[PDB]
Design a protein around this motif. Structure first.
Motif, PDB file in Angstrom:
ATOM      1  N   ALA A  22      66.602  31.031  20.633  1.00 36.70           N
ATOM      2  CA  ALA A  22      66.474  29.584  20.831  1.00 36.70           C
ATOM      3  C   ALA A  22      66.745  29.229  22.290  1.00 36.70           C
ATOM      4  N   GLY A  23      66.280  28.048  22.687  1.00 37.66           N
ATOM      5  CA  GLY A  23      66.564  27.516  24.001  1.00 37.66           C
ATOM      6  C   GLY A  23      65.582  27.965  25.069  1.00 37.66           C
ATOM      7  N   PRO A  24      65.788  27.473  26.287  1.00 41.37           N
ATOM      8  CA  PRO A  24      64.892  27.797  27.398  1.00 41.37           C
ATOM      9  C   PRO A  24      65.216  29.167  27.978  1.00 41.37           C
ATOM     10  N   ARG A  25      64.281  29.682  28.781  1.00 44.08           N
ATOM     11  CA  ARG A  25      64.586  30.868  29.564  1.00 44.08           C
ATOM     12  C   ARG A  25      65.706  30.546  30.547  1.00 44.08           C
ATOM     13  N   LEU A  26      66.637  31.481  30.688  1.00 43.83           N
ATOM     14  CA  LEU A  26      67.755  31.341  31.613  1.00 43.83           C
ATOM     15  C   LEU A  26      67.690  32.321  32.774  1.00 43.83           C
ATOM     16  N   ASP A  27      66.673  33.182  32.830  1.00 44.75           N
ATOM     17  CA  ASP A  27      66.599  34.218  33.860  1.00 44.75           C
ATOM     18  C   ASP A  27      65.819  33.762  35.094  1.00 44.75           C
ATOM     19  N   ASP A  28      66.155  32.576  35.604  1.00 43.49           N
ATOM     20  CA  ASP A  28      65.501  32.009  36.774  1.00 43.49           C
ATOM     21  C   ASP A  28      66.397  31.999  38.005  1.00 43.49           C
ATOM     22  N   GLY A  29      67.556  32.648  37.949  1.00 47.59           N
ATOM     23  CA  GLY A  29      68.424  32.721  39.111  1.00 47.59           C
ATOM     24  C   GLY A  29      69.181  31.454  39.426  1.00 47.59           C
ATOM     25  N   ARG A  30      69.143  30.462  38.544  1.00 50.97           N
ATOM     26  CA  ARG A  30      69.935  29.250  38.683  1.00 50.97           C
ATOM     27  C   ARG A  30      71.159  29.352  37.789  1.00 50.97           C
ATOM     28  N   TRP A  31      72.240  28.690  38.191  1.00 45.34           N
ATOM     29  CA  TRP A  31      73.398  28.617  37.311  1.00 45.34           C
ATOM     30  C   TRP A  31      73.080  27.730  36.108  1.00 45.34           C
ATOM     31  N   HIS A  32      73.454  28.194  34.913  1.00 47.41           N
ATOM     32  CA  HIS A  32      73.271  27.447  33.671  1.00 47.41           C
ATOM     33  C   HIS A  32      74.592  27.335  32.936  1.00 47.41           C
ATOM     34  N   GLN A  33      74.909  26.129  32.460  1.00 53.42           N
ATOM     35  CA  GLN A  33      76.064  25.954  31.588  1.00 53.42           C
ATOM     36  C   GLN A  33      75.687  26.322  30.163  1.00 53.42           C
ATOM     37  N   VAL A  34      76.546  27.095  29.512  1.00 59.29           N
ATOM     38  CA  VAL A  34      76.384  27.465  28.115  1.00 59.29           C
ATOM     39  C   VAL A  34      77.680  27.099  27.417  1.00 59.29           C
ATOM     40  N   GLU A  35      77.578  26.406  26.294  1.00 60.76           N
ATOM     41  CA  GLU A  35      78.763  26.104  25.496  1.00 60.76           C
ATOM     42  C   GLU A  35      78.500  26.524  24.061  1.00 60.76           C
ATOM     43  N   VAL A  36      79.452  27.228  23.466  1.00 63.40           N
ATOM     44  CA  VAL A  36      79.377  27.633  22.066  1.00 63.40           C
ATOM     45  C   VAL A  36      80.469  26.893  21.317  1.00 63.40           C
ATOM     46  N   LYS A  37      80.109  26.249  20.211  1.00 64.25           N
ATOM     47  CA  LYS A  37      81.069  25.434  19.478  1.00 64.25           C
ATOM     48  C   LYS A  37      80.992  25.762  18.002  1.00 64.25           C
ATOM     49  N   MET A  38      82.147  25.927  17.379  1.00 61.29           N
ATOM     50  CA  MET A  38      82.217  26.041  15.933  1.00 61.29           C
ATOM     51  C   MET A  38      82.648  24.693  15.378  1.00 61.29           C
ATOM     52  N   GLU A  39      81.808  24.104  14.535  1.00 57.44           N
ATOM     53  CA  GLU A  39      82.041  22.769  13.994  1.00 57.44           C
ATOM     54  C   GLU A  39      81.786  22.811  12.492  1.00 57.44           C
TER      55      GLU A  39
END
Ligand SMILES: C#C[C@]1(O)CC[C@H]2[C@@H]3CCC4=Cc5oncc5C[C@]4(C)[C@H]3CC[C@@]21C
Ligand SMILES: C#C[C@]1(O)CC[C@H]2[C@@H]3CCC4=Cc5oncc5C[C@]4(C)[C@H]3CC[C@@]21C
Ligand SMILES: [Ca+2]
Ligand SMILES: [Ca+2]
Lengths: 171, 171
Positions: free
Chosen positions: A76-93
């Protein structure tokens, strides 16, 4: 201050938590990579039947999960391998696990977990698995040639141990 | 030319396919709604243990799936309840099911199906389920007050029957 995520496929750090003391069930970090495939982090209470992996495959987030309630392999989600910093958050709800990328919810795995509180020891490994890659539901090459920063894992109050930072390598 | 997707929760159309004649395993449609929750389409070979649902919950795509290989409830993608037309494409590729929204892959459920070819009759229902909503893994209110257009379902060569369009209501 950033650290490298990856010859061997061993994780760069392991932390252990007391599950009976977890109150905060979320983790947040930033990741940067040109690499399309690898492990970002792994966690378990038992590497045989209660484990979780977040990684990249074809540039995009992939979760593999195996516990009493669910067994899945999901991208799921966009490609992240573009050399830019990306925030990722994982949450259990509740009974769900949520994935947010750059402040957008991209994936919600529903009905996959009972209460964490209710084997009370959880491990989190960064940049590698705590078992051989062939144990995955869908193998990938674990080494992710990327960098990690601004990372916070679950509840420092619940943390029992954390690996020697002597091994960390700055980016 | 658009059609309404929804008092009763019955689907607005049902189609039946010969699974032994399927070559094209994708479907594409456009949907427009201000409604955050409901069924877009359902499919099965057996409503007791081999079924699939695509809907909205909290505005976003949700897939529920129950077959021999996988059982899951997954949310993914952007909110679609903004009153704009959105393209949605569902594709079966190898052992995976892919969801594309507005030309972006938003979800890939991997290792969830064996070959379709290998009970050889599949039903697709639009705008409703072919069982009571309480049979879902996670109940939702099925009526989606939205509109559907430019819709193509799997392989017209494999289609055995399609419900009376007498019931369709233009938007
Ligand atoms: C117990 C238990 C389990 O069934 C076995 C392994 C656990 C994951 C380990 C890693 C993890 C880290 C983490 O970071 N923020 C939230 C979470 C929660 C998750 C996704 C945990 C969710 C619950 C899991 C699937
Ligand atoms: C057989 C079988 C199954 O295990 C039981 C129900 C089937 C879905 C019905 C609806 C459907 C419509 C459709 O439209 N494009 C691709 C697909 C494929 C899917 C997602 C089908 C994938 C395979 C499924 C899960
Ligand atoms: Ca790699
Ligand atoms: Ca509704």
């Amino acid at each position: 201050p950033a650290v490298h995520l990856s010859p061997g496929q061993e994780p760069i750090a392991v932390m252990t938590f007391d599950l009976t003391k977890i109150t905060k069930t979320s983790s947040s970090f930033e990741v940067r990579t040109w690499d399309p495939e690898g492990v970002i982090f792994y966690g378990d209470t038992n590497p045989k039947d209660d484990w979780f992996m977040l990684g990249l495959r074809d540039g995009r987030p992939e979760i593999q999960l195996h516990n009493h309630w669910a067994q899945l392999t999901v991208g799921a989600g966009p490609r992240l391998d573009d050399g830019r910093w990306h925030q990722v958050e994982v949450k259990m709800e509740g009974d769900s696990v949520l994935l947010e990328v750059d402040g957008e919810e991209v994936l919600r795995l529903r009905q996959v977990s009972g209460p964490l509180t209710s084997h009370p020891i959880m491990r989190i490994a960064l940049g590698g698995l705590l078992f051989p890659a062939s144990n995955l539901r869908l193998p990938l090459v674990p080494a992710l040639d990327g960098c990690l920063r601004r990372d916070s894992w679950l509840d420092k109050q619940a943390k029992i141990s954390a690996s020697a930072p002597t091994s960390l390598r700055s980016c």
